[PDB]
């Protein structure tokens, strides 16, 4: 839920790929979640 959560982590590769890797459940998603929409 979009309540501003620090559990989610954003990483970039220097080719300009900002994919979200969350650090409590560890997600590799190139998609922008509803809480990061």
Q: Which residues have a Cβ under 8 Å from the Cβ of 22 and sit 6 or more positions away? A: 7, 8, 9
Would you kindly state where each structural domain of the chain is located, as residue ranges? 1-37
In which residue are the tokens 């190139």 written?
30
Positive or negative: CA dihedral 2, 13, 25, 30: positive
Secondary structure of residue 31 in the 3-state scheme? coil
CATH for the 1-37 domain, from 2.20.70.10, 3.30.56.10, 2.60.120.10, 3.10.28.10: 2.20.70.10
Nearest to 35 by CA among 12, 13, 8, 10: 8
Q: Which residue has the tokens 């994919």?
A: 19
Per-residue tokens: 15:
């080719």
Please state, in angstroms and rounded to a whole number, the distance separating the CA atoms of residues 10 and 17: 10
Hey, is 22 helix, strand or coil?
strand
Q: How was this structure determined?
A: NMR
């Amino acid at each position: 839920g979009a309540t501003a959560v620090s559990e989610w982590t954003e990483y970039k590769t220097a080719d300009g790929k900002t994919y979200y890797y969350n650090n409590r459940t560890l997600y590799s998603t190139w998609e922008k979640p509803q809480e990061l929409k």
